[PDB]
Amino acid sequence: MTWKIIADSGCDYRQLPTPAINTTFVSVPLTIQVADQVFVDDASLDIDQMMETMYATAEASKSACPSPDDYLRAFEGAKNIFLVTITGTLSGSHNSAQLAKNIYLEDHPDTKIHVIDSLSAGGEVDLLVEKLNDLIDQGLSFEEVVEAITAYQEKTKLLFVLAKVDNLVKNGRLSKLIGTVVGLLNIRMVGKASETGTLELLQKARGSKKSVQAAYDELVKAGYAGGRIVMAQRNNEKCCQQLSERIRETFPQADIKILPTSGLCSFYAEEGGLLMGYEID
Ligand SMILES: CCCCC/C=C\C/C=C\CCCCCCCC(=O)O
Ligand code: NA
Numbered sequence: 001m002t003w004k005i006i007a008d009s010g011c012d013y014r015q016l017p018t019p020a021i022n023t024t025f026v027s028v029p030l031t032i033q034v035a036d037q038v039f040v041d042d043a044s045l046d047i048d049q050m051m052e053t054m055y056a057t058a059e060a061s062k063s064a065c066p067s068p069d070d071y072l073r074a075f076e077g078a079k080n081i082f083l084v085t086i087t088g089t090l091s092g093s094h095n096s097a098q099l100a101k102n103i104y105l106e107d108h109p110d111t112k113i114h115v116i117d118s119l120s121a122g123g124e125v126d127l128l129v130e131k132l133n134d135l136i137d138q139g140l141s142f143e144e145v146v147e148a149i150t151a152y153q154e155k156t157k158l159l160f161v162l163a164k165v166d167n168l169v170k171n172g173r174l175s176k177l178i179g180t181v182v183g184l185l186n187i188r189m190v191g192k193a194s195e196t197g198t199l200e201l202l203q204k205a206r207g208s209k210k211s212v213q214a215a216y217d218e219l220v221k222a223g224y225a226g227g228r229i230v231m232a233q234r235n236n237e238k239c240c241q242q243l244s245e246r247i248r249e250t251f252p253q254a255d256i257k258i259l260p261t262s263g264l265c266s267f268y269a270e271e272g273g274l275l276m277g278y279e280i281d
Contacts, residue, residue, distance in 0.1 A: 004078035005132050008066060008093045009041035010086030010121040012232045012259045013129060020137040025129070026074045030093065030264045034061045041263035050263055051271070060170040063264060065092040071100030080142045081113040082149070084128050086264075087197030088117040090173045112142045116149065119197035122265050122275025123230035124158040126257075130228075155227075155279055158193035159202075159218050161211050161239075163272035165189055173268070174199050188272070190214045192222075212243050219247070219278060226251035227279030234261045234273045 003023040005016065009030045016025035029041040032050060034057050039050045054061045075081055083101070088094030094117045101113045118125045131152050135145045165183035168174035178201055182189035188211045190203035205214040229247070231240045240258045248254050261269055269275055 001080075002078045003080045003136050004075070004082070005129055006071070006074050006081060006083040007125060007129055008085050008091075008097075009262045009264045010091070010093070010118075011084065011125040011129055012122060012230075012262050012265060013126060014043040016129060016133055018133075020133050023133065023136055024078065025133075028066045028070050028074055028093075030066060030091070031064045032061055032263060032267050033064065035059055039263060045263045047260075047263050047266050051266060054167075054267065061167065061267070062171060063091075063267065066096055068096045068100040068103065071097050072104055075100070075104050075108075075111070075113070079111055080145075081111065082116065082132050082145070083113065084116045084118050084125055084132070086121045086125065087119045087193065089119065089197035114142075114146045114149075116153070117197070118153070119195075120156075120158045120193045120277070122158065122160070122232040122261065122269070123259070123277030124156050124193065124275075125277070126230040126232065126259065127156050127228060127277045127279070128153065130230075155281065157222055157278055157280055159215055159222070159276050159278070160189070160191050160193075160199075160269065161205070161215055161274045161276075162189045162191070162269055164270040167268050167270060168199070171268075183270075190218060192218070208239055212239055212246065215243055215274070215276070216246050216250075219276075222278075223280040224251070224278055225281060226253045227255070229254060229256045229279070230277040231256065231258045232261045232265055232269075232275040232277075233258060234266045234269050234271055236272050236274050239272075240274065 085094040169179040194200040203214045205211040
């Protein structure tokens with residue numbers, strides 16, 4: 001009776017804290033191409049060297065999603081499989097995962113697989129993976145877990161704050177329309193994952209302290225009530241500690257984690273970026 005939780009590198013975990021029994025976690029890396037060099041976003045990756053190279057290269061850098069075959073490899077040795085991808089609207093990760101599922105079940109019929117399009121990235125995907133692990137530790141059946149995680153995904157949201165969005169624009173994942181009005185000269189984009197898995201603007205905040213206030217206000221407005229938060233950040237630990245204190249001051253039971261971004265999430269959120277997943281109602 002074996003379980004695998006699979007996620008692409010839009011999830012910031014390389015290791016899943018305290019995996020449930022008979023459960024293994026696997027991250028499936030996306031890639032980032034900088035000139036004629038390729039960086040694979042696995043735990044071997046020196047994220048700091050990749051970013052330095054990217055910013056040093058006048059030519060735009062590009063991301064790519066996992067092959068279906070990459071997903072097929074990850075399935076091996078498990079009978080109960082959940083696969084969470086980054087938003088299938090901005091990346092083909094989910095499309096490859098959908099195909100891998102259908103291909104594997106031709107080859108290995110006594111297997112159960114549930115593919116979750118997070119419609120998100122970063123901290124919210126992290127929460128979903130943590131919850132899947134929770135649910136398995138709790139002793140649920142495969143179909144019980146599918147039910148509970150579908151419900152939990154209605155309870156989870158994403159807020160981001162980005163000081164730069166150039167790589168998003170350069171890669172066609174954010175319009176020049178929105179892209180020019182933020183991430184330029186003291187203006188950080190405060191946004192959420194939209195109902196379709198896209199970037200949606202919420203506030204422009206001029207400076208840090210205004211960035212924290214906006215993020216706190218948006219959390220309140222969205223219906224946070226003291227549950228779990230996962231803040232995935234790129235060189236933004238100080239803004240994350242000051243936001244965390246404020247949230248804990250208001251909601252004393254808050255369970256907050258701060259994680260470094262993956263290579264993919266670092267690439268797109270960029271320096272100073274934050275992708276905060278959280279629970280509501
Ligand atoms: C909907 C989530 C929006 C999050 C916005 C904030 C920061 C962006 C950081 C990570 C998300 C990147 C999404 C695009 C991935 C493309 C991968 C590919 O090449 O296939
Ligand atoms: Na959600």
